[model samples]
Target chain A: PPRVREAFALFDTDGDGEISGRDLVLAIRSCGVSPTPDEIKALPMSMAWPDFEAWMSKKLASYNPEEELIKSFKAFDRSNDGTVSADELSQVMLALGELLSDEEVKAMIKEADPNGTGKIQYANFVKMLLK
Target chain B: EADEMYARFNARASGGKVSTGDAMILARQLGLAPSYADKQAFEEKSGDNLDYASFQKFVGTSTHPEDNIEDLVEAFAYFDVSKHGYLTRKQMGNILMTYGEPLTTEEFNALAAEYFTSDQIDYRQFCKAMLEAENL
Candidate 1:
């Protein structure tokens, strides 16, 4: 029932393993909500990367059969390593608007990593968002 | 909302630095002015009639014309090394430089940090930012 492959295919821009703002923007804009001027300006901000992470988390959670969900997944896979990190989260937040605080970020992580595995695996990340 | 946005947009754009070929379409959509006037004026200016902000706004009004999402996602994915959550300057720049606009890692980080203010870029503000840039 899950369109996992379709989502990955949409995000594999370079045919490599990562996704970037170009892809994410397209995905969101397609859904009608896009980054504002301040957000666009904030894009180059490395500090806000974490916000990007949280957003991805939310989007993933909202994944549906529309195929937008998979695109969101690949949006963060810059190098196609198929995973994300705190540093990556920071970069995402920067793109969104600003950086997140330690506590706020911790909360987001907890939301993603429900099993307390300390690290968010791809499957877990995907599943968490799928729900 | 888009139509309303186009109507409210400021038309006195200076496009000397950027190529605003897209503005003509936006002008048409808003019905603020016929394409003839804008085209003539744009041609007279050698295609420079809108600044970055205006150009981006025009693009926004026209609909999300840019669709290079896969590459964009990969760009971010490359940097999310910890696989924990977000993108970092090092990751973004490392990939960015590869696609032709390579920049120093430090400079890239500084630039990225400078742009983000909060956590989300509202659409209206996004339009303003692009038009204000050197050239949209």
Candidate 2:
């Protein structure tokens, strides 16, 4: 309910009080996600504020902050079989749209993983980004 | 194991060969991000469509996406040729008819009532819509 109005406002681009297919697509892409064909099929033809808020609420119930936080963290460090290294972690963040600078990366390696073991756990990587 | 990847390449290939242009797209479909320089070198080295061994040597390897969903992206882009970023019911139906199962006038509208809202779907929605399309 709290964030739903603003979210709905985004999709109600024309301020028509309804989120149409076009607005939904624009909103979805802005959020850095694509909509699937089946999802297109499942979508309500038009949605008012109340309808959207309900949908968001239902979808929201499934995940909390921590899971999303870790999911967001784990997504970048792919090919991390056992653990990530300073080189691999910086490589990921540097190229990523987030564009973590070399200076920042140097500090991250020096700070969060101060021991300088090089190989480190995923949890440490999250802190490196969070802090 | 190498033979397995060859067969999959064969599946994506047309005329019994994979083109340099096609190999890059196929890489995307398989969830790999190939570079532009990779494309230039791919064409230079391969030139013509790649045979199995040529593909194996040049393109590295493939994984997953049993089928190419990029075909859908191509189809959607074609219909939105002017790049309006949104397609009408008729446009969508044109895509649906040829894509998998065919849909008639009444059938499409009926189906539309159930799932196709707003009547205009942009590329992003189209991309995700099918990306998440049942995955069956």
Candidate 3:
């Protein structure tokens, strides 16, 4: 699930714990997700705490999972290689106290990388996780 | 009642907002034991001061779990020490213990079941569950 504050904090730029319709559109755009004209027109000019949260709940339910996954993949791709290598995955797992054998790690890469590239591309990674 | 409580604490001396220190005192007076970390979290959410509106929101929502929402943001941020934006059940237990309230194993399991099957607790769900547990 997305962090609740992540989107709220972005739109509530002034941090008064309130957001406007324009703020919503701006926040969606900030996350690289475009809001339809209808979506923008339907929102109130301003939203109180409860209303804002309710809207967020609805919006997040339909928010693109692929974009969210892409964001995560970017973070994981420390070398900016446009793909997450098995080495990177193992390093992160190790830091989190999970030790995977080289064979197991290779198997994971193989399963994720249908192209046999020995790394997980962004699209393939999302598909692998979703599937 | 909230106005009376604020007046009783002289929270408006800072021009409609109480300082972090005053918020701490007020929370204690209200029978809530807010840790220093809790106060920090509250201040961060309330913009370094607890105004009347924010205080009322806190009191009203906190006393009645179903209405609780805004305060959960601050409360969750307090416990998410790793900045991972989520907490493990163990982390949730630890934070609750700091607040002088610890969950029973059964309660923990129930909350885990309610939120996610995974080990990591989404802070939003954790906040909702924790506040619900608080009322129980």
Candidate 4:
């Protein structure tokens, strides 16, 4: 399914026309999950626009921003189940060298899966993206 | 309450040490527009002393990192000795420590002594040394 434009719209909070590290976190929060301060802090903010874009492009191996967003989503879908479980999401956080505890995971999961669905459906995923 | 806190944090959180206002000045000094309103005051205040030509001169003399993450990390690590968000003396000392030419004990002492006496080193000078380390 084609992604909604909300995520893109909300992520650019100030409408500055460019996303900085702080803006990235705000965009992520709109997706329903709140990121930890440490997670936000770990994000590099020193790189200039071209340098940052180059790094992101290399990570996703896609010059397109849309593909890059999708690539980021897939990264959390660790089980290849096409849906992200809380366990899977937590693992992804850990793989990124974050040592978030169970409480933190549960808090993030509760925020993302407000209905207690035990999994993040794509609609919610998009909402989370837009959140 | 929220207003008070925002004002307070913004006051202390400027681009430099403890002065949120100064941080805005520094940002504007580097040609950035205000991200927050209080920063506007900083920009206005900064107008008194910001010299774009001088800033450009400093950056030109500083180390410019290439398109490599490792190089960036090395640059950061070399300057990040304190593990604090800012640089300290050891960070600067370590860079001088890696000089290719063998310095006499007196020469090394002079440079290292400068490090010991100084608290905050200039960001431009730090970058200059990093670039020198890279042979840039």
TM-score (0 to 1) of chain B, per candidate? Answer: 0.29, 0.39, 0.39, 0.24
Predicted structure with the largest lDDT when compared to the true one: 3
lDDT by residue (A21-54, candidate 2, tens digit) is 7766555444333345886678888887677667
Which residue runs of candidate 1 sit more than 4 Å off their true CA positions? Answer: A1-66, A78-81, A98-102, A113-119, B1-136
Instruction: Quote model 1's TM-score.
Output: 0.21
DockQ (C-alpha based) per candidate is 0.03, 0.01, 0.02, 0.01
Indicate the worst ten consecutive residues by lDDT in candidate 1 chain A: A1-10
Candidate 4: regions farther than 4 A off = A1-50, A55-84, A87-97, B1-136
| Model 4 chain A weakest 10-residue run by lDDT | A1-10
Q: How close is candidate 4 to the true structure, as a TM-score?
A: 0.29
TM-score of each: 0.21, 0.28, 0.28, 0.29
Model 3: lDDT of residue B52 = 73
Interface RMSD of each: 6.6, 10.8, 11.4, 16.0
A97 in model 4: Cα distance from truth in Å? 5.7
Between candidates 1 and 3, name the one with more favorable DockQ. Answer: 1
Per-residue lDDT of B74 in model 3: 62
lDDT of 3 by residue, B1-136 (tens): 5667868656344776777677666765675545566556666667666677787565553443334666776666764546567766655654443234555667566756766677676777555554553323
